[PDB]
């Protein structure tokens, strides 16, 4: 009821964003871009994950 | 530090014999003069006993053998 609302809001997609065409190089770059305000939490990026 | 006792339950596969073995070792460390068989991190006697069970160098058989050996040595030194 609050942990699940947080994880639902975080893991959702809106078809537009501050950065939607960018291709990231890992989860750490995703956090670095979100915290800097350069991308939205609901972007549609391509992340290289292991 | 201790949070989860799962490895100790793996070593002593009952979780009810684990309590008794750890209690016996903790009472040895506390009432008796026995020193821990593992470098403590300012943990209490119960956590040290549980860690020693996790590291593998204690169980019911080992505790029984050690107690019997020390009783035999005390008897021999009694004359």
């Amino acid at each position: 009821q609050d942990v699940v609302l947080g994880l639902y809001y975080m893991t959702r997609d809106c078809v537009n964003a501050k950065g939607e065409g960018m291709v990231l190089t890992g989860p750490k770059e995703a956090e670095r871009l979100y915290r800097s305000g350069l991308a939205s939490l609901h972007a549609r990026v391509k992340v290289r994950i292991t | 530090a201790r949070v989860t006792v799962q490895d100790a339950v793996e070593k002593i596969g009952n979780r009810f014999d684990l309590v008794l073995v750890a209690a016996r070792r903790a009472r040895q460390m506390q009432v008796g003069g026995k020193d821990p068989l593992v470098p403590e991190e300012n943990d209490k006697t119960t956590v040290i006993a549980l860690r020693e069970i996790e590291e593998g160098l204690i169980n019911n058989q080992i505790l029984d053998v050690r107690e019997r050996q020390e009783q035999q040595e005390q008897e021999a030194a009694e004359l």
Binding site: G21, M22, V23, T25, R35, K46, R48 | -
Partner: protein, 220 residues
């Protein structure tokens, strides 16, 4: 009434290098968040460094295309070049060349020396080649900047990550002096891309923040 609890670095506990974790306590009540967020905002997006800004490959002029004999796609070559941590001397921007051929992985040890331009990870893989006749070559322009500059804000463009800090994340918890009820204990966990040490990047960010507060400091 002007004396606050001045913190000290309790420990600089480091996982394998460039993954340090510094704790300072006891901060005054509420100062954990001010210091943590100020350092986080400085480290994340306002910090000098050098990174690959752009790259031109001879055999391809479009981002969504392919070169024969190269295992990765150009979209992945740009990703591999983004993580290329490089430190440059007094020159603001330099250009390097990646001429190579033959079946095998292309690593950062295969770039031209360019004198004082130093690559921190010679084992960093840029591309894989699949044919002995397949030769790859590219000019990578690395420029000095501050923070993160995405390519959309700005001949293939690469999102330039000038700042060395890959991930900075603080976490304030509770600490106490002998009678103080509830204080702060700042726990900063910083990773860098190898071109700088985290226990040095913290001091760099602190110097940057402190030099901002010089025109209106009391020197007391």
């Amino acid at each position: 009434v002007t004396e606050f609890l001045k913190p000290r670095l309790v420990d600089i506990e480091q996982v394998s290098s460039t993954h340090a974790k510094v704790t300072l306590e006891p901060l005054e009540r509420g100062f954990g968040h001010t210091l943590g967020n100020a350092l986080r905002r400085i480290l994340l997006s306002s910090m000098p460094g050098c990174a690959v800004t752009e790259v031109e490959i001879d055999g391809v002029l479009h981002e969504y295309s392919t070169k024969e004999g190269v295992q990765e796609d150009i979209l992945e070559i740009l990703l591999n070049l983004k993580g290329l941590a490089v430190r440059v001397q007094g020159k603001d921007e330099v250009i390097l060349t990646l001429n190579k051929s033959g079946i095998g992985p292309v690593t950062a040890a295969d770039i031209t020396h360019d004198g004082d331009v130093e690559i921190v990870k010679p084992q960093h893989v840029i591309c894989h080649l699949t044919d002995e006749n397949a030769s790859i070559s590219m000019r990578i322009k690395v420029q000095r900047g501050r923070g993160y500059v995405p390519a959309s804000t700005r001949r293939l463009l690469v999102d330039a990550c000038y700042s060395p800090v890959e991930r900075i994340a603080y976490n304030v918890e509770a600490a106490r002096v002998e009678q103080r009820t509830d204080l702060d204990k700042l726990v900063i966990e910083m990773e860098t891309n190898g071109t700088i040490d985290p226990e040095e990047a913290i001091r760099r960010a602190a110097t940057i923040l402190a030099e901002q507060l010089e025109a209106f400091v009391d020197l007391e």
